[PDB]
Design a protein around this ligand. Structure first.
Ligand SMILES: [Mg+2]
Ligand SMILES: [Mn+2]
Ligand SMILES: [Mn+2]
Lengths: 153, 144
């Protein structure tokens, strides 16, 4: 797969990584695929003890839900289209940012977010270090009470 | 009238809008002249702009409006302010477009005489903050 360092990458290095990958379509163009039904297409470009890299192809309906990445830092580069990056606020008036093609962002391991509102056919590259082996998925009950499900991923 | 969702538009939708309008010269060609409104309603303001080389917006924000710009002919310089005084400058050439969310601060300057561009804002541009420096060097924002 990818020829990356044998160590964890910090946020900035992860952002450099997804941006340089966007400039090397030889590493990912083959894997571009839009599942007509089923779940969010994801394609692993690289998974080892230190870094995970995925190529994501979005449908208009795709939604990560609210989640954290446990101990993983991460970065996202939008290659084509646009996404909405959302961050939760306790009041309920959550922060929403449009990330469009050519743009990228990164976060450390404390980040809680939701990606949704994609242009149909959008394409993005995501990288995580350490690997995204566990994620916390938040849900709300009828009461309004918030819980966090830790998911092996 | 423009067939648009009945709501404020985000920066991606505004970019799509200005590029779509650029591809339909039947709607704006008559209005080139060296600021013509193409459509204004509760959700969007869409403008055709013809630039002279001396034109300068000054540093400003759009309060709560997202925006997009398509350069139809010529070229513009888009500048974003930086702490330190070494502002970031980008030439936007004919065919090219960009958009921004409501937190944007920028300055647009004509880069070639006779440039023509299409801009769109949502929500409509009711207030703009124009930034200035006094003789202290202290920055202020006048809401216009
Ligand atoms: Mg209208
Ligand atoms: Mn995530
Ligand atoms: Mn402006």
């Amino acid at each position: 797969e990818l020829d990356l360092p044998e160590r964890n990458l910090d946020r900035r290095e992860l952002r450099d990584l997804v941006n340089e990958l966007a400039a090397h379509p030889e590493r990912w163009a083959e894997h571009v695929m839009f599942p007509e039904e089923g779940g969010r297409h994801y394609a692993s470009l690289h998974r080892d003890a230190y870094v995970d890299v995925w190529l994501l192809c979005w449908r208009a309906e795709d939604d990560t839900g609210w989640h954290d990445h446990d101990i993983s830092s991460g970065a996202v580069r939008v290659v084509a289209g646009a996404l909405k990056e959302c961050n939760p606020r306790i009041g309920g008036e959550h922060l929403e940012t449009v990330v469009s093609e050519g743009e990228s962002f990164s976060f450390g391991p404390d980040h809680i977010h939701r990606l949704t509102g994609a242009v149909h056919g959008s394409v993005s590259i995501a990288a995580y270090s350490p690997p995204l082996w566990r994620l916390g998925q938040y849900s709300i009950d009828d009461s309004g009470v918030m819980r966090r499900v830790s998911v092996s991923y």
